[PDB]
Enzyme design. Structure first.
Site, PDB file in Angstrom:
ATOM      1  N   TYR A  11       0.808  -1.196   0.000  1.00  0.00           N
ATOM      2  CA  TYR A  11       0.000   0.000   0.000  1.00  0.00           C
ATOM      3  C   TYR A  11       0.858   1.270   0.000  1.00  0.00           C
ATOM      4  O   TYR A  11       0.357   2.403   0.044  1.00  0.00           O
ATOM      5  CB  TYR A  11      -0.974  -0.001   1.200  1.00  0.00           C
ATOM      6  CG  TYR A  11      -2.046  -1.070   1.134  1.00  0.00           C
ATOM      7  CD1 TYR A  11      -2.760  -1.287  -0.037  1.00  0.00           C
ATOM      8  CD2 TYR A  11      -2.338  -1.898   2.219  1.00  0.00           C
ATOM      9  CE1 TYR A  11      -3.748  -2.242  -0.140  1.00  0.00           C
ATOM     10  CE2 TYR A  11      -3.329  -2.874   2.135  1.00  0.00           C
ATOM     11  CZ  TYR A  11      -4.014  -3.056   0.962  1.00  0.00           C
ATOM     12  OH  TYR A  11      -5.003  -4.013   0.864  1.00  0.00           O
ATOM     13  N   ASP A  16      -1.804 -11.176   9.079  1.00  0.00           N
ATOM     14  CA  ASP A  16      -0.838 -12.160   8.660  1.00  0.00           C
ATOM     15  C   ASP A  16       0.573 -11.954   9.178  1.00  0.00           C
ATOM     16  O   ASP A  16       1.225 -12.985   9.429  1.00  0.00           O
ATOM     17  CB  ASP A  16      -0.812 -12.306   7.120  1.00  0.00           C
ATOM     18  CG  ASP A  16      -1.826 -13.386   6.761  1.00  0.00           C
ATOM     19  OD1 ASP A  16      -2.410 -13.951   7.721  1.00  0.00           O
ATOM     20  OD2 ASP A  16      -2.060 -13.684   5.581  1.00  0.00           O
ATOM     21  N   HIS A  27       5.546  -6.251  -3.948  1.00  0.00           N
ATOM     22  CA  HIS A  27       4.135  -6.620  -4.104  1.00  0.00           C
ATOM     23  C   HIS A  27       3.283  -5.355  -4.151  1.00  0.00           C
ATOM     24  O   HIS A  27       3.716  -4.345  -3.630  1.00  0.00           O
ATOM     25  CB  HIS A  27       3.689  -7.535  -2.952  1.00  0.00           C
ATOM     26  CG  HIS A  27       4.014  -7.001  -1.592  1.00  0.00           C
ATOM     27  ND1 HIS A  27       5.336  -6.762  -1.257  1.00  0.00           N
ATOM     28  CD2 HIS A  27       3.287  -6.653  -0.511  1.00  0.00           C
ATOM     29  CE1 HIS A  27       5.420  -6.293  -0.036  1.00  0.00           C
ATOM     30  NE2 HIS A  27       4.185  -6.232   0.429  1.00  0.00           N
ATOM     31  N   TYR A  30     -11.502  -1.632  -1.007  1.00  0.00           N
ATOM     32  CA  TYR A  30     -11.629  -1.127   0.359  1.00  0.00           C
ATOM     33  C   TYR A  30     -10.396  -0.358   0.847  1.00  0.00           C
ATOM     34  O   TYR A  30     -10.497   0.422   1.788  1.00  0.00           O
ATOM     35  CB  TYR A  30     -11.968  -2.262   1.335  1.00  0.00           C
ATOM     36  CG  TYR A  30     -10.813  -2.807   2.140  1.00  0.00           C
ATOM     37  CD1 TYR A  30      -9.839  -3.543   1.489  1.00  0.00           C
ATOM     38  CD2 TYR A  30     -10.673  -2.638   3.522  1.00  0.00           C
ATOM     39  CE1 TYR A  30      -8.736  -4.103   2.125  1.00  0.00           C
ATOM     40  CE2 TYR A  30      -9.574  -3.186   4.194  1.00  0.00           C
ATOM     41  CZ  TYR A  30      -8.647  -3.933   3.499  1.00  0.00           C
ATOM     42  OH  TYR A  30      -7.603  -4.414   4.235  1.00  0.00           O
ATOM     43  N   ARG A  31      -9.268  -0.586   0.218  1.00  0.00           N
ATOM     44  CA  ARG A  31      -8.002   0.033   0.634  1.00  0.00           C
ATOM     45  C   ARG A  31      -7.009   0.093  -0.527  1.00  0.00           C
ATOM     46  O   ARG A  31      -7.115  -0.845  -1.343  1.00  0.00           O
ATOM     47  CB  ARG A  31      -7.453  -0.912   1.717  1.00  0.00           C
ATOM     48  CG  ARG A  31      -6.287  -0.388   2.544  1.00  0.00           C
ATOM     49  CD  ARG A  31      -6.129  -1.312   3.770  1.00  0.00           C
ATOM     50  NE  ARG A  31      -4.875  -1.092   4.486  1.00  0.00           N
ATOM     51  CZ  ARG A  31      -4.343  -1.941   5.362  1.00  0.00           C
ATOM     52  NH1 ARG A  31      -4.925  -3.108   5.670  1.00  0.00           N
ATOM     53  NH2 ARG A  31      -3.189  -1.634   5.956  1.00  0.00           N
TER      54      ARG A  31
HETATM   55  C1  LIG Z   1       2.644 -10.455   3.504  1.00  0.00           C
HETATM   56  C2  LIG Z   1       1.667  -9.422   3.994  1.00  0.00           C
HETATM   57  C3  LIG Z   1       0.534  -9.769   4.644  1.00  0.00           C
HETATM   58  C4  LIG Z   1      -0.370  -8.803   5.089  1.00  0.00           C
HETATM   59  N1  LIG Z   1      -1.457  -9.242   5.762  1.00  0.00           N
HETATM   60  C5  LIG Z   1      -2.352  -8.352   6.186  1.00  0.00           C
HETATM   61  C6  LIG Z   1      -3.531  -8.839   6.864  1.00  0.00           C
HETATM   62  O1  LIG Z   1      -3.750 -10.012   7.092  1.00  0.00           O
HETATM   63  N2  LIG Z   1      -4.443  -7.908   7.255  1.00  0.00           N
HETATM   64  C7  LIG Z   1      -4.192  -6.522   7.031  1.00  0.00           C
HETATM   65  O2  LIG Z   1      -5.037  -5.789   7.439  1.00  0.00           O
HETATM   66  N3  LIG Z   1      -3.105  -6.092   6.415  1.00  0.00           N
HETATM   67  C8  LIG Z   1      -2.151  -6.930   5.981  1.00  0.00           C
HETATM   68  N4  LIG Z   1      -1.052  -6.507   5.354  1.00  0.00           N
HETATM   69  C9  LIG Z   1      -0.822  -5.091   5.006  1.00  0.00           C
HETATM   70  C10 LIG Z   1       0.066  -4.310   6.004  1.00  0.00           C
HETATM   71  O3  LIG Z   1       1.334  -4.950   6.052  1.00  0.00           O
HETATM   72  C11 LIG Z   1      -0.577  -4.377   7.388  1.00  0.00           C
HETATM   73  O4  LIG Z   1      -1.901  -3.909   7.252  1.00  0.00           O
HETATM   74  C12 LIG Z   1       0.165  -3.481   8.357  1.00  0.00           C
HETATM   75  O5  LIG Z   1      -0.284  -3.594   9.737  1.00  0.00           O
HETATM   76  C13 LIG Z   1      -0.001  -1.992   7.928  1.00  0.00           C
HETATM   77  O6  LIG Z   1       1.242  -1.206   8.495  1.00  0.00           O
HETATM   78  P1  LIG Z   1       1.616  -0.560   9.817  1.00  0.00           P
HETATM   79  O7  LIG Z   1       0.709  -1.136  10.872  1.00  0.00           O
HETATM   80  O8  LIG Z   1       3.014  -0.686   9.955  1.00  0.00           O
HETATM   81  O9  LIG Z   1       1.048   0.765   9.555  1.00  0.00           O
HETATM   82  P2  LIG Z   1       1.451   2.190   9.082  1.00  0.00           P
HETATM   83  O10 LIG Z   1       2.176   2.256   7.755  1.00  0.00           O
HETATM   84  O11 LIG Z   1       2.106   2.757  10.135  1.00  0.00           O
HETATM   85  O12 LIG Z   1       0.193   2.946   8.796  1.00  0.00           O
HETATM   86  C14 LIG Z   1      -0.665   2.815   7.625  1.00  0.00           C
HETATM   87  C15 LIG Z   1      -1.390   4.151   7.363  1.00  0.00           C
HETATM   88  O13 LIG Z   1      -2.282   4.513   8.444  1.00  0.00           O
HETATM   89  C16 LIG Z   1      -2.352   5.944   8.612  1.00  0.00           C
HETATM   90  N5  LIG Z   1      -1.868   6.141   9.977  1.00  0.00           N
HETATM   91  C17 LIG Z   1      -1.020   5.311  10.657  1.00  0.00           C
HETATM   92  N6  LIG Z   1      -0.735   5.755  11.884  1.00  0.00           N
HETATM   93  C18 LIG Z   1      -1.421   6.939  11.975  1.00  0.00           C
HETATM   94  C19 LIG Z   1      -1.534   7.899  13.065  1.00  0.00           C
HETATM   95  N7  LIG Z   1      -0.912   7.758  14.206  1.00  0.00           N
HETATM   96  N8  LIG Z   1      -2.316   8.969  12.805  1.00  0.00           N
HETATM   97  C20 LIG Z   1      -2.957   9.172  11.623  1.00  0.00           C
HETATM   98  N9  LIG Z   1      -2.941   8.318  10.593  1.00  0.00           N
HETATM   99  C21 LIG Z   1      -2.143   7.229  10.793  1.00  0.00           C
HETATM  100  C22 LIG Z   1      -1.490   6.555   7.548  1.00  0.00           C
HETATM  101  O14 LIG Z   1      -2.294   6.844   6.441  1.00  0.00           O
HETATM  102  C23 LIG Z   1      -0.539   5.426   7.192  1.00  0.00           C
HETATM  103  O15 LIG Z   1       0.111   5.494   5.965  1.00  0.00           O
HETATM  104  C24 LIG Z   1      -0.107  -7.439   4.854  1.00  0.00           C
HETATM  105  C25 LIG Z   1       1.046  -7.074   4.201  1.00  0.00           C
HETATM  106  C26 LIG Z   1       1.945  -8.025   3.750  1.00  0.00           C
HETATM  107  C27 LIG Z   1       3.206  -7.630   3.024  1.00  0.00           C
HETATM  108  O1  LIG Z   2      -5.552  -5.473   3.190  1.00  0.00           O
HETATM  109  C1  LIG Z   2      -5.209  -6.780   3.317  1.00  0.00           C
HETATM  110  C2  LIG Z   2      -4.005  -7.136   2.731  1.00  0.00           C
HETATM  111  C3  LIG Z   2      -3.601  -8.486   2.787  1.00  0.00           C
HETATM  112  C4  LIG Z   2      -4.401  -9.408   3.472  1.00  0.00           C
HETATM  113  C5  LIG Z   2      -4.005 -10.816   3.495  1.00  0.00           C
HETATM  114  F1  LIG Z   2      -5.179 -11.534   3.530  1.00  0.00           F
HETATM  115  F2  LIG Z   2      -3.479 -11.108   2.320  1.00  0.00           F
HETATM  116  F3  LIG Z   2      -3.271 -11.296   4.451  1.00  0.00           F
HETATM  117  C6  LIG Z   2      -5.609  -9.010   4.056  1.00  0.00           C
HETATM  118  C7  LIG Z   2      -6.026  -7.676   3.990  1.00  0.00           C
END
Ligand SMILES: Cc1cc2nc3c(=O)[nH]c(=O)nc-3n(C[C@H](O)[C@H](O)[C@H](O)COP(=O)(O)OP(=O)(O)OC[C@H]3O[C@@H](n4cnc5c(N)ncnc54)[C@H](O)[C@@H]3O)c2cc1C
Ligand SMILES: Oc1ccc(C(F)(F)F)cc1
Ligand SMILES: Cc1cc2nc3c(=O)[nH]c(=O)nc-3n(C[C@H](O)[C@H](O)[C@H](O)COP(=O)(O)OP(=O)(O)OC[C@H]3O[C@@H](n4cnc5c(N)ncnc54)[C@H](O)[C@@H]3O)c2cc1C
Ligand SMILES: Cc1cc2nc3c(=O)[nH]c(=O)nc-3n(C[C@H](O)[C@H](O)[C@H](O)COP(=O)(O)OP(=O)(O)OC[C@H]3O[C@@H](n4cnc5c(N)ncnc54)[C@H](O)[C@@H]3O)c2cc1C
Ligand SMILES: Oc1ccc(C(F)(F)F)cc1
Ligand SMILES: Oc1ccc(C(F)(F)F)cc1
Lengths: 550, 550, 550
Positions: A98, A160, A412, A493-494
């Site tokens: 993202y 994840d 990715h 959704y995102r």
């Molecule tokens: C292999 C893999 C698997 C993943 N699996 C999942 C999964 O199962 N489910 C899922 O939901 N996601 C998943 N993700 C996506 C992502 O890695 C996770 O969602 C992760 O938790 C998002 O990053 P972060 O918590 O480090 O957030 P951050 O990058 O810190 O934040 C994301 C965004 O939130 C906003 N934000 C963050 N903090 C603040 C703040 N304090 N105030 C205001 N705005 C703010 C900003 O817009 C920011 O860019 C996956 C990614 C990968 C590579």
């Molecule tokens: O936004 C996301 C991104 C990745 C995932 C998963 F399922 F691949 F782990 C779930 C929600």
């Protein structure tokens, strides 16, 4: 520090230096960084998009600043309003797929809130909740529970990967896999620094904890919350919480998250679906089960390559450069003892209730020929089921990062539409998406996450980050899928920074009423447009749409 | 029509007449009523507060207008912006205990949305949802399900009385008693007329249904929604839905509500708690059960007089004018075969699962001496359990209206704080409230509705609406309770027109940051301040706080 | 000088330096101080609150500047409007118990007016008045009278300590103990520097002294006043004087104060009240006496510990850490030959009239059992009566500072409500306040000063300034007393910087009409909000209420 590669819109180098000198005064030289390396998941890069898809000079920070506390965030917001400098708040910055930690506007200051604002502020047993700062990763809160022996009482809900921020993932409306999987819906009581610099607490967080000798004279940021703050989310009057998710309306400094009490019994399972076409009947079987509580958590339907990629890179299964054929996918399935589609789920609670639901689940799924059922113990040591067995009980892991390396310099990008929980709808969306992936020269890789009345369909586009021609094909694929999916009634959704405008323009019923209303709200609360301009396609009036949109 | 008793702020009589003539042109003379009778629950009055607590000239409409459709709402908002005339949108107007249909600002136009905008727009089986206009009462939706034989597939979730608006109760964030009892959280996809008169649809409702020949040329209001509109609430970007609940931010014309599929098994029950002090242990027993799913719906803990009042008026139990003693409360309990506190709940689902949970519930509650357990069949014909047996399966009733007649010219006012699900906290809130009720010369009458991590405590203050001295004691009681409860860390979730300002002032952490932020949002979207000025204490800048606040 | 610990809101370090360079140009390096020690009463600290109650970074000046004359004040106001820098004018800065010289807003420039603007400008015999600059302490004007032998003709009216500023105490509406004790009411003709920098003279001070050769060409500041300037306070038209007391409406550079001609006879006295409950009857005896002129001055009713503390610290009477008991208070009384309450008063004028009033006073007070009457000569050398004998004839002393050292690192805070002159009201206020003092772990210490139809009840909270836990208890006590006293119909007449907002919010009749009207006046005369923002809870529109109020 003096000369950044990129400056924010309209700001002079002398103002940049003035501003940066002022910040270094506040937080110290150790917490301010001037950008005059993609890093890793372990040490996320905070200056740009590591899994680059777009060209250079897009999404590049001028500096990274790390507040020591809420006072510094307020001081920095004040400076940003004074010089009209855009800020991009991150918690941990692991939003890989993202955009990582990168700013939507190049030249922005990336505000690293998690480095110093790290604390688990409270874990409450009777109210079954926790309160966290931006810096608490899922792994940290797990460690905190373990250290104080709270895992026998309260479980987490994790995505994840374990390194994400509990708060950052919740404000993005991320997904986890237990019954508490809708992260945003488990929140209650948030603290925010508004664009004007003022501190706000939502809901029952607005009802002050009554004076007592022990808490007198504390700064607002350090005051405790009243008794119902993290138990009832609504408070009184307008329920404004949602304006701080996926938005640029404020900087989140604290959040309360509901935690599931140990349910007194657990059992994860895997149901293998032999054919590619078995997605249809499976999803139709899932529908009533999900609505009725046989499926309590957020079960997932994973495509064979997602599991295959966890276990090894493409070169370990085939040496072709082109997309694996249907026939090769069937062979990989056979080698791993998996189906073309693989349903992962879990049963919670007393044995007597789990038994009844498990018989219901088995009975229903037996209508699909050649279905096989496994518990973790019936699979090999390196199986995905063994990893997901931990995930579905809230234990953090890092195994799933391995699919990113499917290609040599794998990077990715996630394409993430929502589908109905109906075999017909799921098959049509998969067919749409599989076709375009093949036109681009890429393997289809994906999962469906099962929400109550909807499914999140996470298409994992993986590519070689150094391959120019493939990068362009990736940009084509994304944009084409966005348009194809909207023409069939599906929205995402995102998304990643580079597709936020295009995806917001899809939500244009009644001549873009939704975006117009959001811009009105953004311009009123953020008159100088300093808080994450462009997040979700929402631009403040000083950012010309012609110049900035993608 | 020409001369109303009260005109809105700053409007001339000639402008009133011009405006009303303009409206009569649009909707017809049959849909416009100029106020130049308290009515009933059956025929709710739309001009003023029936259960009056405040004096005359407060909360009195100048006229009642009933749009025939969304186009008329848009036209009327246009006229209100032109003339600076305040509007007060109601759906059914049965908000008894909270002001009925009366406007916060005297001279307002009451906008009766339900009279003509009445339709059950859609009942979807596979997505288990419904879509409704403001005039759909719970009774109407029930009748719609019965007429099309849908009760075998989908159930409703109803408050204590079946005459309310499904949409109006949801936007007030009301409560029902099945597992779908958090009405506001079951919504998905709403249509709103903004103060600028533009139509907006939230979430996935912003993603337009793709063009097709059959739907070409329809007005915005009449267009269908895309497939995921009522299945996934969030959409993309900022989640603004909550800004339209308990607010003056817009006029709601349509809403989607999730409906629970027949669970395949049901059993309601009653547990009688013999002593007044048994509230403490019972709530402590309830806590873990509520979090773990032995209690799936919204069970209630009713005080003996609430059930006694359902069965008969105060004169039928005692002829004293003063509050019944503890000793008289025990005597009433015995006569009805109830305890001093009575717990009403239900089990849902297949017998084998209900049987296990029921043993769990019985076993935990048996720690309280003299506890007795009843199913509807074990109680008399006129019992509250038999009425609630229907309520907890989504069937509308009107029996509970009878507690309002506890006193001669009974009028009611609800004092509604939130409490922790802890015996200690519940006892302390009851003790505070019972004491002040006694100081006012009134009987304590109330219920606790059990949310997951909180309880709504509905104190029913009933009084003789023609007794001046008692009316003043009621006013005193309410304002003192608001203050005492805030000094003990509790706020109210919902209130009557006369106490909205005082309750918003309670939510003043950080020097009223929450109300300041809301006012900024309200002035930006409603620059002429015509949509329900003062709702929830939220006043537009043209309404001086000094003049208007109560 | 270059780097201050704290900068004023929104000002850059480079602007700070520019501004400070500009000021040093005007007044010299010897008169400008940059804060990059609590001091004493003898050498008051001008940079912060010495008797700290709140935490660090609250009420901290960025610099101290001392104008040489009125031209420099005008020049500095001009600079402050140019850079938007807040100013905090003090005269002597001995407002101990109310915050000392500290600014309400941290980073403000403290304007030390008394250092160089020190002169006794005129003492007029026939008109019985004096004219003074900010720097004239009560001790200086005493010395001026003595040096020119004017004590046989004119007496002063002094507060308990001689080092206060005659003008600073009058603009705070302070209290003294002769018949001229209402300091603010004895004023006539003031000179002010407005926020716009212009010079204004009030009353008859606006009627210019007619031209004469000897006064031609003088700057406005140096011109003499007309004949009636310091004889009749009203002038003509609006009587605006009161807008410059306890306010941030202007900078006072000069003031005329009425002085009492030697009354031709004087005799101070002490009446001891044996029991704690004797306050009631005594105050009821005082009432008619005060209204009828038997009591001409401002007699005081002092609690035993106030007198005890003057004579020695707590450790000299008891070694307990907790509050002395009732029984221990009776023992101290006996040791000092005082009552639990001690009435100090004085008779003025010819012997024949004093004799008649004295018999009236003795006769009335004899209704209380065990009352004893003393003249200074009948008491020991170190007695409070001997000190107050000087005070009630306008002779300055410093003896009363000794009660501050009651505790080891004694620091004091004054809680100062007004009570009716009625035994019932005084007893209820004392009871309220004594109770809370005991809950905090503190000894009740206090006086009542008797105004004509009201009493100032000065509660002297003394604490250890290095004791963190006691500091917090002190903050709790104050805030709780403020709320308790307002709920019983009493407000405070004066306060410390940290309680000004809370006390202004108490004066909220009709939805805070009083504060709204004052803000309107402040914003009109001070558009850049540079003059003491927050003084009395009155904030200029550039200071967000959410950010700054306490
Ligand atoms: C292999 C893999 C698997 C993943 N699996 C999942 C999964 O199962 N489910 C899922 O939901 N996601 C998943 N993700 C996506 C992502 O890695 C996770 O969602 C992760 O938790 C998002 O990053 P972060 O918590 O480090 O957030 P951050 O990058 O810190 O934040 C994301 C965004 O939130 C906003 N934000 C963050 N903090 C603040 C703040 N304090 N105030 C205001 N705005 C703010 C900003 O817009 C920011 O860019 C996956 C990614 C990968 C590579
Ligand atoms: O936004 C996301 C991104 C990745 C995932 C998963 F399922 F691949 F782990 C779930 C929600
Ligand atoms: C005996 C008794 C029992 C009750 N039990 C319950 C209970 O169990 N649960 C419960 O929740 N309540 C209960 N109530 C309270 C009330 O009766 C119900 O909440 C009822 O549904 C509210 O009225 P309505 O639906 O008629 O709403 P309305 O009066 O139509 O609306 C209430 C308010 O919602 C807003 N509003 C409504 N429609 C719109 C619109 N279209 N656009 C914008 N704003 C709008 C307005 O602020 C309006 O004043 C009870 C009341 C009584 C007397
Ligand atoms: C033991 C003790 C006994 C006390 N007894 C008494 C008593 O009997 N009666 C009494 O009244 N007080 C009393 N006080 C309180 C205080 O010490 C005196 O009131 C003292 O005179 C106030 O200080 P100052 O004159 O040095 O004034 P300053 O601190 O100089 O001024 C006080 C305030 O007045 C305003 N102000 C001052 N000068 C100007 C100006 N030129 N322009 C604009 N605004 C201005 C500012 O808001 C400033 O903070 C007592 C204090 C103690 C510790
Ligand atoms: O707001 C509410 C909620 C519940 C009820 C009751 F009493 F039926 F439980 C009344 C009013
Ligand atoms: O404001 C005041 C007035 C009087 C006093 C005292 F104690 F000398 F009486 C202190 C502070």
């Amino acid at each position: 520090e003096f000369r950044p590669l990129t400056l924010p819109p309209k700001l002079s180098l002398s103002d940049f230096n003035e501003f940066i000198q002022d910040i270094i005064r506040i937080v110290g030289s150790e917490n301010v960084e001037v950008i005059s390396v993609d890093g890793s998941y372990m040490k996320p890069t905070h200056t740009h998009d590591p899994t680059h898809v777009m060209d250079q000079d897009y999404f590049l920070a001028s500096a990274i600043v790390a507040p020591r506390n809420v006072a510094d965030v307020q001081s920095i917001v004040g400076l940003a309003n004074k010089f009209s400098f855009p800020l991009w708040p991150i918690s941990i910055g692991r939003n890989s797929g993202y955009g990582g930690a990168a700013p939507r506007v190049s030249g922005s200051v990336v505000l690293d809130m998690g480095k110093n604002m790290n604390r688990v502020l409270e874990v409450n047993v009777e109210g079954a909740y926790c309160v966290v700062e931006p810096g608490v990763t899922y792994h940290d809160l797990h460690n905190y529970l373990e250290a104080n022996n709270l895992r026998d009482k309260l479980w987490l809900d994790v995505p994840d990967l374990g390194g994400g921020s509990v708060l950052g993932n919740a404000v993005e409306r991320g997904v986890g896999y237990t019954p508490y999987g809708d992260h945003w819906m488990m929140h209650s009581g948030m603290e925010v620094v508004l664009a004007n610099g003022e501190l706000l607490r939502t809901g029952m967080g607005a009802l002050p904890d009554p004076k007592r000798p022990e808490t007198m004279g504390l700064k607002p940021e350090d005051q405790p919350w009243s008794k119902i703050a993290h138990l009832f989310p609504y408070g009184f009057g307008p329920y404004i919480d949602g304006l701080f998710s996926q938005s640029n309306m404020g900087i989140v400094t604290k959040i309360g998250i509901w935690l599931m009490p140990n349910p007194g019994g657990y059992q994860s399972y895997l149901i293998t679906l032999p054919k590619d076409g078995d997605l249809k009947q499976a999803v139709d079987i899932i529908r009533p089960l999900r609505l009725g509580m046989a499926l309590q958590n957020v079960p997932t339907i994973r495509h064979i390559l997602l599991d295959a990629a966890v276990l090894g890179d493409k070169r370990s299964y085939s040496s072709r450069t082109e997309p694996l054929s249907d026939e090769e996918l069937d062979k990989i399935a056979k080698q791993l003892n998996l189906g073309r589609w693989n349903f992962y789920g879990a049963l919670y609670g007393p044995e007597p209730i789990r038994r009844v639901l498990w018989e219901t689940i088995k009975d229903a799924f037996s209508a699909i020929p050649g279905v096989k059922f496994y518990f973790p113990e019936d699979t090999p040591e390196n199986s995905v089921l063994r990893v997901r067995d931990k995930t579905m009980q809230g234990i953090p892991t890092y195994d799933e990062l391995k699919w990113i390396d499917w290609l040599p310099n794998g990077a990715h990008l996630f394409f993430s539409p929502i589908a109905k929980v109906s075999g017909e709808d799921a098959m049509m969306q998969y067919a749409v998406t599989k076709k375009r992936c093949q036109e681009a020269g890429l393997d289809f890789i994906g999962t469906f996450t099962v929400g109550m009345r909807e499914m999140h369909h996470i298409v994992c586009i993986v590519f070689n980050k150094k391959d120019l021609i493939q990068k362009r094909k990736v940009q084509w694929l994304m944009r084409t899928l966005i348009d194809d999916c909207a023409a069939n009634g599906w929205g995402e959704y995102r998304t990643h920074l580079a597709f936020m405008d295009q995806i917001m323009e899809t939500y244009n019923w009644n001549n873009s009423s939704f975006l117009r209303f959001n811009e009105v709200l953004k311009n009123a609360v953020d008159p100088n447009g300093i808080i994450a301009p462009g997040k979700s396609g929402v631009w403040p009036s000083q950012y010309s749409h012609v110049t900035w949109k993608l």
